[PDB]
Amino acid sequence: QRHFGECNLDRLNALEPTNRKESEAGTVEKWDKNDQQFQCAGVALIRHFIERRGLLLPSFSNAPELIYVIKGRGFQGAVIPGCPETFESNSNRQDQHQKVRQIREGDILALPAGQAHWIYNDGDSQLVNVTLLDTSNAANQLDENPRKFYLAGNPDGTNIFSGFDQETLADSFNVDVDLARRLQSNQDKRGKIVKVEQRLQILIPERQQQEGFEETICSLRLMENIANPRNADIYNPQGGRISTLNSNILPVLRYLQLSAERGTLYREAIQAPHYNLNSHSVIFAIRGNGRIQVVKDNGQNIFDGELRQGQALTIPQNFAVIKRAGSEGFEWVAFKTNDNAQRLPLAGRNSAIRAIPEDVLINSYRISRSEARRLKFIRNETTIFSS
């Protein structure tokens, strides 16, 4: 499983990005991967803002990643090693490439370590991605640095071709030295997100062109929408909804050993106090605000504040956590560091308190039987509590 990191957590802060890299067609923001809570989780978090007609150049990383589409719409092309190109032009009157998928608000995209992909903004809204790079994943045999290996452009030359001699590139591609030198992108000053000329041409149905195991590879599904209300796993009309994404929903996750959760708390509603049995949870606030408390092993509160849109907070494995939305509701995505992440609620239906005999609670807290029965049974909802 995972490599280990230090988890002597005394204090948590809401975390915002601390580095920003501007490209001609967008902005890449990095959270502080050395803040203790991301070191303890073994993760890094990144946000891309891709302007209209922007292209996130192809790259791969040593870390498996989950990418959540905050807003907008576009296309993703993942490059599966060894698999044939199954999208093609009609030769009996050009283009040929691996399958591409439309992406949109609420999509989670899963990318194994080492696999290249590119993303294009096909809409007019900014396309906004939040990516979790899981650097403590068993798939990452390097180290805690989430590296980006760029196949093109000059992200800092600085792409993968930049370090080879052009004679080697020319012979490998079987092209003239003029074109081989182009591979190195020595004179490119556009950064990692670039404007395409006019509109990007790609093969996709009803879009006509103009002018960590491999045993599933080729046919894998890599994306699933977790924001669509029709996919809710938990729903309360005055509390909200929760949707979990795991290997029973998306089989590749069994090899990535990641999960995700998408939550919407209605105004003033509560997500039951709980802890995660078998993973850390990296919460990214999508909209509204939520009061959150996190408690560590010796009972000490290590976070007692609010999480606002654009902020992130890490709940380490087994630390107890409670959330209460503000007057405008609270929406988040959580990235979790295991296959089939599971929550153990501490209050309400299906909770640890409810699983425990009344007699034990009576002696545990020194309450009367009527107090114990109310403790166990007065909140009859599960997970999401109505206001």
Partner: protein, 414 residues
């Protein structure tokens, strides 16, 4: 550290690092920075629970196997999402609901509880809430080994128990809950805002105040009266998982030597949840002067707990160095690191021990006896390897006869 990499020049029996005296019993901790335990990546706890006392419900991010050395009682483990299938719904309850012509959505029920007894091994999955109730005659003594290096623990090496209740015995601007709860270890509810918990549980704040009160009784508490309202059996389907197995070698054994003793190996082929904990245990009984064949464990570290009698144990490392050479007595704890070779000879009254192992499917290689790797080597390979006669090589391979893991003394007759 030199210990964390098991570069240990001498191993010793390991004594409890902390002793915590609670109202309802005593807790002994073998903490992770003991040199032997750093090597093995484990912690241990011995809990002695007075009769009619209970442990305060708790959980931790690493799996644990628990050997019940004395007594009997009840064990509770919660599995989130499993229905509560132990209940005492009454005929009067039933009649009332039906005859009202009004039952709808708008006297107890709880999850399964397990009778545990002397000789049981208990499998506690990482993250699972558990509690113990000693409803028997005598003190309940449980010896627990927690695998801190298990893949389920994504935290770090420090043993980390989370208390749902109880605490330390003794006879953007954050909003100050940390300042408030202080007034050196509390239950997790002390870390939450009183009013938030009250709203979440839908109960008056009074009850939450009592939940958060500093409880000087500790980790084990005496029960008001006998807990007769607990429902008990003797009063994907993971919810049906077995978590207890009795180790008594007289009831089951994999190796029986009429004149030497018995070994009972409880691995994932006897208790299926061990596949997921990736832990296992072994119980052995050696007759007087019997030996446990020289051997090494291929895929696990071992913590040994001596439950009866005594023996002399020797352990060798990859340098031909003796790293352990001690007489071991009842109640002693010691570690055999993965790959190190070990041999034991029981004393005049025999030897019983429990071994807790960091693999669900343990593998060991024996060096003497009927299934040894020495019998698997060609005799002429042994002759050249050891510079001995082919006659001596043959004797190495067959003088021990049909005994494999438990060997009678070759020099003292019963």
């Amino acid at each position: 550290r030199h210990f964390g990499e098991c570069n240990l020049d001498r191993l010793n029996v390991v004594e409890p690092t902390n002793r915590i005296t609670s109202e309802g019993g005593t807790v002994e901790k073998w903490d992770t920075n003991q040199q032997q335990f750093q090597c093995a990546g484990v912690a241990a706890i011995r809990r002695t629970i007075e009769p009619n006392s209970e442990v305060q419900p708790n959980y931790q991010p690493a799996p644990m196997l628990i050997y019940i050395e004395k007594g009997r009682g009840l064990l509770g483990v919660v599995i989130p999402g499993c229905a509560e299938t132990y209940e005492s719904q009454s005929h009067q309850q039933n009649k009332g609901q039906r005859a009202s012509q009004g039952q709808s959505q708008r006297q107890d029920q709880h999850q399964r509880v397990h009778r545990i007894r002397e000789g049981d091994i208990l499998a506690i999955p990482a993250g699972v809430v558990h509690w113990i109730y000693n409803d028997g005659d005598q003190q309940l003594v449980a010896f627990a080994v927690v695998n801190q290096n298990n893949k389920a623990n994504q935290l770090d090496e420090e043993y980390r128990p989370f208390l749902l209740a109880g605490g330390q015995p003794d006879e953007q601007g954050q909003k100050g809950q940390k300042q408030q709860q202080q007034a050196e270890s509390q239950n997790i509810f002390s870390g939450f805002d009183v009013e938030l918990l009250a709203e979440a549980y839908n109960i008056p704040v009074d009850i939450v105040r009592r939940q958060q009160q500093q409880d000087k009784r500790g980790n084990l508490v005496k029960l008001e009266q006998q807990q007769i309202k607990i429902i008990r059996a003797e009063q994907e389907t993971i919810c049906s998982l077995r978590l207890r197995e009795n180790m008594t070698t007289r009831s089951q054994s994999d190796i029986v030597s009429r004149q030497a003793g018995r070994i009972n190996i409880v691995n994932q082929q006897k208790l299926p949840v061990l596949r997921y904990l990736n832990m296992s245990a072994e119980r052995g009984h050696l007759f007087p002067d019997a030996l446990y064949v020289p051997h090494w464990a291929q895929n696990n570290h071992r913590v040994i707990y001596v439950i009866r009698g005594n023996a002399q144990v020797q352990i060798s490392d990859d340098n031909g160095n003796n790293v352990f050479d001690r007489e071991i007595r009842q109640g002693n704890v010691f570690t055999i690191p993965q790959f190190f070779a070990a041999i034991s000879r029981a004393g005049s009254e025999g030897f019983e021990y429990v071994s807790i192992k960091t693999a669900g499917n343990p593998n060991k290689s024996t060096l003497a006896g009927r299934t040894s790797v020495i019998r698997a080597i060609p005799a002429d390979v042994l002759a050249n390897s050891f510079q001995i006669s082919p006659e001596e090589a043959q004797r190495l391979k067959h003088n021990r006869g049909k005994q494999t893991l438990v060997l009678s003394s070759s020099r003292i007759s019963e």
